[PDB]
Amino acid sequence: SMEQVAMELRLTELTRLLRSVLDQLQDKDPARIFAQPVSLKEVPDYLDHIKHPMDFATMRKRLEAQGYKNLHEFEEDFDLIIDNCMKYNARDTVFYRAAVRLRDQGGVVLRQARREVDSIG
């Protein structure tokens, strides 16, 4: 149908906007602490602690399959990155501190993304 196409065009544009948001959030992680999944070879107990692991490469795979229907879904995944780290790592660690900084800096990016998504529909 023409409607399914129109729908698919909106998704594609959402994907375009989320790709830019993702690049901006990932620049706030210059140490690449959150770039890849926590290694189960190097942290063999990880899944005993963290039930839904997440990282920027995993988000990128979902993104490019147009797997985010709306901003709320994308934000859920970004919040997993931060919240998982803040539970697994203690407060006095470079990891926890990196998550706090990513959260704080990402807030600005995500604030304007929500306005853009509502604005452009």
Side-chain angles (χ1 to χ4, degrees), residues 101-110 112-119:
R101 293 166 60 81
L102 177 61
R103 189 196 60 187
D104 286 352
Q105 297 196 279
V108 186
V109 173
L110 290 171
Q112 204 53 41
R114 160 56 61 206
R115 296 194 62 85
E116 283 178 318
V117 164
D118 292 5
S119 177

Side-chain angles (χ1 to χ4, degrees), residues 1-2 4-6 8 11-15 17-19:
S1 73
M2 212 19 260
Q4 288 304 320
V5 172
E8 292 160 356
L11 184 55
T12 293
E13 286 307 305
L14 175 65
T15 305
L17 184 156
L18 301 178
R19 190 181 300 110

Side-chain angles (χ1 to χ4, degrees), residues 39-40 42-60 62-68 70-109:
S39 174
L40 304 177
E42 306 174 358
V43 188
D45 74 353
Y46 191 60
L47 303 183
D48 292 348
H49 292 271
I50 295 298
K51 298 301 175 186
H52 297 101
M54 192 44 57
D55 66 273
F56 287 132
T58 303
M59 294 188 60
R60 200 171 290 281
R62 188 164 161 192
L63 179 65
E64 292 312 337
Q66 301 188 341
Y68 294 115
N70 55 55
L71 187 55
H72 178 80
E73 290 187 346
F74 177 96
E75 291 172 310
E76 290 195 331
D77 271 356
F78 176 67
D79 283 338
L80 273 178
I81 293 176
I82 296 312
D83 291 338
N84 288 347
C85 183
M86 290 175 77
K87 290 167 190 63
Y88 191 79
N89 303 108
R91 209 155 37 250
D92 72 336
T93 64
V94 66
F95 307 107
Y96 183 111
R97 287 160 176 287
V100 166
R101 293 166 60 81
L102 177 61
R103 189 196 60 187
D104 286 352
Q105 297 196 279
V108 186
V109 173

Side-chain angles (χ1 to χ4, degrees), residues 18-37:
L18 301 178
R19 190 181 300 110
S20 173
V21 175
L22 185 65
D23 294 338
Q24 286 176 73
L25 296 172
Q26 190 154 27
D27 290 336
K28 309 313 184 158
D29 172 32
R32 298 194 70 86
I33 291 164
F34 304 104
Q36 293 292 332

